[PDB]
RNA sequence: AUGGAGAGUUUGAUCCUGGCUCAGGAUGAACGCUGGCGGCGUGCCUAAUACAUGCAAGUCGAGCGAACGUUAGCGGCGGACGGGUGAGUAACACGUGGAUAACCUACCUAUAAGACUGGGAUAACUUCGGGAAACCGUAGCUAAUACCGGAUAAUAUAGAAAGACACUUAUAGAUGGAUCCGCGCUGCAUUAGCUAGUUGGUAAGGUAACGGCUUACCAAGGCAACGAUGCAUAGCCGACCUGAGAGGGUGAUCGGCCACACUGGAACUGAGACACGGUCCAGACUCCUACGGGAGGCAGCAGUAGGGAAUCUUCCGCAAUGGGCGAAAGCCUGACGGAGCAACGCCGCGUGAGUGAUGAAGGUCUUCGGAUCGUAAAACUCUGUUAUUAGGGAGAACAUAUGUGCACAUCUUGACGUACCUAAUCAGAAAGCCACGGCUAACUACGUGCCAGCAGCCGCGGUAAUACGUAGGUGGCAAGCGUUAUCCGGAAUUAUUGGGCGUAAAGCGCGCGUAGGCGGUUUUUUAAGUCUGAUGUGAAAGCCCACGGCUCAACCGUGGAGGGUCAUUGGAAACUGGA
């Protein structure tokens, strides 16, 4: 009766829409893109702030894969 | 018997069953010094339940009828 | 949603109730993240409330309540009235 | 229990100790086929299993119902030799076999209701009664005095250890420890200590 | 050492090895039945037997649009969890440890956190052509603590939507999995062998991890006896019998885990699957039929059909114990509880004699000799323990004005409601079946007379079978009794305590040769070694030294005692086969 998305959501979590992940892909497409033409969005570490005024006000990305740009981004400067 | 079996089987006793073609209880138990038959056949088994000459039994060999 | 769930393991029709750190998606025989020893309801000897709850402190602070109700059982522990 | 006659108790067995005359008007030869014939001599296995047969017929409890008994003729610590005439005692024959009540087993173990019964409190209509160091195994108030709990009193005048009776009362509450040698010595006693084991 | 252990079988009796025909308990049982009353439990054991069903579990605004605390239905939220049967991994899969420089650690609630910053908008409402249902069309929309990244903290040294008189980066409280080795695993003689990046090398990545995963290349008869490699196939364990111990067994329970979900196969945004009733794809099945379709849990419950010597009702309730929904309240439950169920073991209150005429009216064997089925007995008294209506009432224990830091107040229960018992003291019945010459505690008359019976061992039947069948019986035991398949007494019987190196149970004719199984070498060694050492731990459906009662039954606390610990050398060398 009540839809399940806290216990076995595995699958339950992957069977709608994926418009919005494949937009979040082609987002994080410039991982490395923008690393190798020295792009100003990943400028001013100070803030990437990254984590007073980013992780809540408007993230959408994955957990262990983002914490890997998480750490030498928000903390280099 | 069941399982396409043939076996030389034999009903011991003087119960004289007179309904062929019909299943009969194969009596566990095998014959004693007896070349040819090594099997026996329990009596009645939805089928002639024999005689009722007998009553020092009252227990096997298709007993029935309890003297009152 | 952690409270003392009281684990009822042992023989059929009569399980040996332990109060334990357990969580509410894993009813009865589930997960005890603090141990409290175990409550003995026999009411026929001495040793009866000989719950070990010196490691269940830390969890008195972010998920620690009652799981099977029991709050005369919890009585006994009065670990509070110190904040 | 046994629903049979007790007069066999003293022909199959060696140790009946039930009554006084019994071979007197019977024949005190051998078994019963062969009762003109010679005796035999009982076997190792057959000597512990002969008595077990031999109190089969005394005791009220047999093959399975006398659990306890055989249990606290066992496991229970002390003299496991002499722990099936010690630990064996606690029945409600023995209140019967020392007031006055009842001169045979059998008889005492229906003398729990006919006779003295209320053992100062609860009562028990059993074999067996709970006749410890403050229970006074008396009669009750409509069955104070009875016909079968008041039969031979001047007739027993002699009565037995650790146990009570008196007119009008016959009610035991005497010393709880008895005697381990105050009963028959006809059995083997380390032979039913080992055999029962296994 | 609570301290096993019969025979026959072979002359006409025999000893002696040897094997079981056979002096017993057990029998998840059924059984032909003579199965008075019952506490408690198991019950398609024969059956992963096919399929009509009753059927998984509903909800929520402190945050939003009916007519009238949530009433509009979106959003938070178990379909995989309760469950069901166990064909399925001869093996970390489970049983069983430290662990992790093989390691992830999503997750669950408290505080930082200031409700910040880009927002339109969303189902309902509903403009709505038709369609037997088998589906397109006509389409505007309106919300909600539904909801949107960069510059100011976290491996640097390149913060929000809003709570009453909710909240977010960091993280804690908490939390689920992958892993090393030490442990359970059949033999083939009528098979005697198997891996080749077998054996180790480092580099394209990415997941619980190194990575023979592929990465460049790498050997010959090498691997393997550790039968690897073939099979055997089974859900694994906590367990109960057992020799007296020495030996030996080692799972029905009831819970953990490991599975499965017509059959397979490939993929699918929100928080940990292949999903017991979401997808698609195919296959052979299910059935009605508007020509199109629907498809199947009954692997959730109870049933129709299956053949079972061999097994539960298509019955009430959520008392309660639950958890999931859900500011409370509300609200969910063939999870679970209560009644039908059979000798399934019930063993006892257990059914009448205080008394008592040869106790017969004459029969049980009767050469009648007496006794007696017979201190059976009359007909009463006796024995209470059958009704007669009865009103009856521990796993799991604290609460609900708004007056109260793991403490708690006006105000929170029933699906019930007849143990032992000395009491009313009506009269409600322990019978039975078996051997009876026996072996083995047991019989008299007739009737039989190799006709039939009896018939484990014996055998009894061609005449005087009390062995047969009826009557009077007798030994046994216990509300009953004979039967069928399953361990151990029997007895060591691949010998192990429990085998010879000759008749027994035993001469390889193989005379010439290392299977490393094993056959004096003096002294001599540096410490293979016998008895001391880290001891915390010392737990346990474990024999707990006691521990609680249910009379006959299931009523359970003692981790130090307590063994079933978890000090037995680092060590004292003139010494199995090898000097």
Same mark, same amino acid.
């Given at each position: 009766?009540?839809?399940? @998305? ?5 699958? @339950? ?6 418009? #919005? ?10 991982? @490395? ?23 809540? #006000? ?13 750490? #030498? ?5 | ?68 | +949603?952690?409270?003392? !769930?009281?684990? !009822?393991?042992?023989?059929? !029709? ?8 357990? /969580? +509410? !998606?894993?009813?009865? /025989?589930?997960?005890?993240? %603090? ?8 009411? +026929?000897?001495?040793? %009866?409330?000989?719950?070990? %709850? +010196? ?21 006994? %522990? ?6 | ?9 003293? $022909? *199959? ?36 299993? $002969?008595?077990?047969?031999?109190? *089969?017929?005394? =005791?009220? &409890?047999?093959? $399975? ?19 099936? &005439?010690?630990?064996?005692?606690? $029945? ?36 067996? =009664? ?31 250890? =650790? ?32 055999? =029962?084991?296994?």
């Amino acid at each position: 009766k009540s839809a399940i @998305k806290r216990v076995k959501t595995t699958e @339950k979590a992957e069977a709608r829409n994926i418009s #919005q992940k494949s937009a979040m892909r082609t987002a994080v497409k410039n991982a @490395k893109t923008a690393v190798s033409n020295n792009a100003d969005n990943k400028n001013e570490l100070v803030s990437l702030v990254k984590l007073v005024d980013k992780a809540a #006000q408007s993230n959408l990305i994955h957990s262990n894969k983002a914490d890997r740009i998480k750490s #030498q981004l928000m903390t280099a400067n | 018997l069941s399982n396409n079996i043939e076996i030389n089987a034999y009903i011991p006793g003087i119960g004289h069953n007179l309904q062929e073609h019909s299943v009969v209880l194969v009596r566990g138990g095998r014959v004693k010094d007896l070349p040819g038959v090594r099997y026996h056949i329990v009596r009645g088994a939805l089928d002639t339940s024999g005689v009722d000459g007998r009553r020092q039994g009252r227990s096997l060999y298709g007993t029935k009828k309890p003297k009152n | +949603a952690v409270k003392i !769930r009281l684990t !009822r393991l042992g023989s059929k !029709r009569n399980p040996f109730y332990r109060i334990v750190v357990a /969580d +509410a !998606r894993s009813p009865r /025989d589930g997960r005890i993240i %603090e141990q409290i020893g175990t409550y003995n309801p026999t009411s +026929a000897n001495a040793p %009866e409330i000989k719950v070990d %709850e +010196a490691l269940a402190l830390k969890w008195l602070n972010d998920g620690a309540k009652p799981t099977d109700t029991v709050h005369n059982i919890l009585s006994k %522990e009065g670990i509070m009235k110190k904040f | 229990r046994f629903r049979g006659s007790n007069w066999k108790k003293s $022909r *199959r067995l060696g140790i009946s100790l039930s009554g006084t005359g019994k071979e007197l008007e019977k024949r005190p030869y051998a078994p019963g086929q062969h009762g003109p014939n010679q005796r035999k001599k009982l076997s190792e296995y057959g000597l512990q299993l $002969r008595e077990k047969q031999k109190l *089969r017929y005394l =005791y009220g &409890m047999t093959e $399975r119902q006398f659990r306890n008994t055989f249990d606290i003729a066992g496991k229970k610590f002390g003299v496991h030799g002499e722990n099936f &005439m010690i630990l064996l005692a606690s $029945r409600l024959d023995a209140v019967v076999y020392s007031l006055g009540l009842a001169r045979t087993r059998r008889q005492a173990r229906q003398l729990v209701n006919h006779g003295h019964i209320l053992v100062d409190g609860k009562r028990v209509d059993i074999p067996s =009664y709970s006749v410890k160091p403050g229970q006074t195994i008396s009669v009750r108030e409509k069955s104070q005095k009875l016909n079968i709990i008041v039969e031979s009193v001047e007739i027993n005048n002699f009565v037995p250890e =650790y146990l009570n009776f008196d007119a009008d009362s016959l009610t035991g509450t005497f010393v709880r420890l008895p005697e381990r040698s105050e009963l028959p010595a006809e059995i083997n006693e380390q032979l039913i200590v080992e055999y =029962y084991s296994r």
